Structures are given as structure tokens and as C-alpha cells.
RNA sequence: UGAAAUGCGCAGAUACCGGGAGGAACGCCGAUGGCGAAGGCAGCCACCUGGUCCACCCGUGACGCUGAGGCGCGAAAGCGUGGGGAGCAAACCGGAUUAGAUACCCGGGUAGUCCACGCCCUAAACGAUGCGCGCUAGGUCUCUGGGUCUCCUGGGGGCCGAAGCUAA
């Protein structure tokens, strides 16, 4: 719509999916993809790194029309796919960004944490 | 202890070679230490500085007369 | 997960954003590092407090060493009373694997793990090496203090090695 050019892209890993959403110097977003975004169905689509590969593409080709072309990347949780690839799930998107075209300024690293929110099941703790 | 506390009771403790002021040196350190030893009943390595004091102040007694 | 299944989810889970509550631990720095008598001790802040090194050589003038029994401290688990309980998890309840599986793998889960007060007193509580002092080539890296600071000197941590020691 309005090209910004600069902006953030912050990627979302997780053992389930990947979602990635650039926005603006801002914070307000300009769009997002995910593993769901792009057709792919529920087991694969979500978690694949490759997934997590087209859908950080499909972020920044969208992202492009709207004229951006630096970002920065904000990395949050850890996550990747069962995928035979080696599948950081995570790595893969922060990949595809900085091929996407964009240039990417830099790779941060932000996952939140809880103070100590409640007891995490699934073999944790 | 502070102030030059510390000084003070040593000026005041002698001329002396001071072993009679070394024994004032150490029982006002002790008094402290037990003070601090009656709160943190806990601090046990804290205690073990005491042991050494306490310790040598006895030593010292006899050693002088 | 090797594959799975139990399990959870349409009373809407998973993935995502925001808000809140609670418990436990303290990423990077971090080391081949430091402290303590040992057990042991790592977010930051203040208070209270122990040990220890160096320089000056100023004071006392053998006041020293070791130390049976005592007293004290003493990881984890465990015990008593009360509190707390997010994650983890003996026992236990299930799923799978197997010839069987009272196990390893997967899903749950109580004591416990946390705090206080008291108790227990153990260990591969290890350097498997009691403490003090003196004497006997060096080389190299390192932590901390002094110096006339491309190195000397003091205390500590490692490596290699003289003489020597050792069954190796």
C-alpha cells in the first residue's frame, strides 16, 4: 500500500508451526504468512522447515509490494519439524528471509520467558 | 568496627607492646562477632572466625602470664 | 516414537497476540577462572559477617606445632510440625517393546524436590594423597598484590620436567 522499505520481520518458531510477520520500524504489521498461510495441511504444513521456508517467503515477497525491502529479525521460541531435513524448523525462515531479497540488518534472538507462569507438562520441568 | 574505633581502643588500650591491648583488640572484636552470631544464627563460617579469635585471646592469656 | 499407542483437542486444543497469578531456577559474562576447613558456594541491590594475600617493617618478644576423648559444622536421600507446590518426579496408573518387561521408550502421577523450626550424619564426604616446618634444576600458561612493570618479586591454580622416589 504505502511503501515503508524498512521495517522488522519477527518469526515465530514452534514444534507445531511457523509464523512469520513483518512489520513496520513501527511494530504495526504489514503482513504474515505461516505454514498454514500457504496450503499445506496441518502435520506438515505446520512444523516443516520447508514450510517454515515458504512461508518466510511468502512474507517477504508480499512484504516487497508494500516496498520493504532492509529488515530485522526477531527470532522467538525454538521450534523446527520432524522433517528428514535437519530442520531447525527455526533456521530455515531466518534462511529464507536473508535470501528472500531483503537485506537483512540483523537476527535477534527475543523468546520471551515467563516469570515462572505454571507448571509445563509434556516431560518438562 | 569503625571510627577509628578500632584506633581508639588501641591508643587507649597502651603504650604497651600491646599485648594487653591485643586482648582488648580481640575481646571487642568477639563482642561483635557475638553480637552478630546472636542474629544469623546460621552463619556458620562467620563462627568459625570467632573460633579463631576466641582462640587466640586464651593463648594469648596464658602465653602473657 | 525406531515405528507406534496411551493422551490432549469442536465444552475449540496445537500454532499466534495481549493481560494476570504462582512456584522454582538464575542464560550471556563463565574460564582451561575464583572463594571456603570440608560439605560446598554463581541474576542484581543493600545491611550484617568469616577467611585471605601484598607493601611498610612500625609494635609484642617463642606467645610455637600437633592434637586422644569433647564441641561444632557436615552433599543427597530420609524423619517430625507447619507452610508452599510452577516444572520435575521413587511409588503408583496407563501406552508400547518383548518369548516374558514387574525395565529401558511414550502419557500421566503421589511422596519428594522449595521455606521455616527441629532431627538424621551418611557418601566414589576423592587429590581415593592427615597437619606444620625446613631443604632439593628449571621451563610454560594462568588468577590476585607489589616493583625500578618488554621483567623481577609474594600468594594461589594448571601443564611439562632436574635430582630423587615408585612394583609399575
Do not use: W
Not at chain 1, 12 to 17: E, G, L, R, T
Not at chain 2, 10 to 25: R, T
Amino acid at each position: 500500500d504505502n511503501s515503508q522499505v524498512f521495517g522488522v520481520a519477527r518469526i515465530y518458531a514452534s514444534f507445531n508451526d511457523t509464523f512469520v510477520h513483518v512489520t513496520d520500524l513501527s511494530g504495526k504489521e504489514t503482513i504474515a504468512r505461516v505454514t498454514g498461510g500457504m496450503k499445506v495441511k496441518a502435520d506438515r504444513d505446520e512444523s516443516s522447515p520447508y514450510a517454515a521456508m515458504l512461508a518466510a517467503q511468502d512474507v517477504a515477497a508480499k512484504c516487497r509490494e508494500v516496498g520493504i525491502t532492509a529488515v530485522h529479525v526477531k527470532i522467538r521460541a525454538t521450534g523446527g519439524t520432524r522433517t528428514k531435513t535437519p530442520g531447525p524448523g527455526g533456521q530455515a525462515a531466518l534462511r529464507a528471509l536473508a535470501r528472500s531479497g531483503l537485506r537483512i540488518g540483523r537476527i535477534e534472538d527475543v523468546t520471551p520467558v515467563p516469570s515462572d507462569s505454571t507448571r509445563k507438562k509434556g516431560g518438562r520441568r | 568496627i569503625t571510627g577509628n574505633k578500632i584506633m581508639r581502643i588501641l591508643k587507649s588500650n597502651g603504650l604497651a607492646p600491646e599485648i594487653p591491648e591485643d586482648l582488648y583488640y580481640l575481646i571487642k572484636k568477639a563482642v561483635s562477632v557475638r553480637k552478630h552470631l546472636e542474629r544469623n544464627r546460621k552463619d556458620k563460617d562467620a563462627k568459625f572466625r570467632l573460633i579463631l579469635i576466641e582462640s587466640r585471646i586464651h593463648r594469648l592469656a596464658r602465653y602473657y602470664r
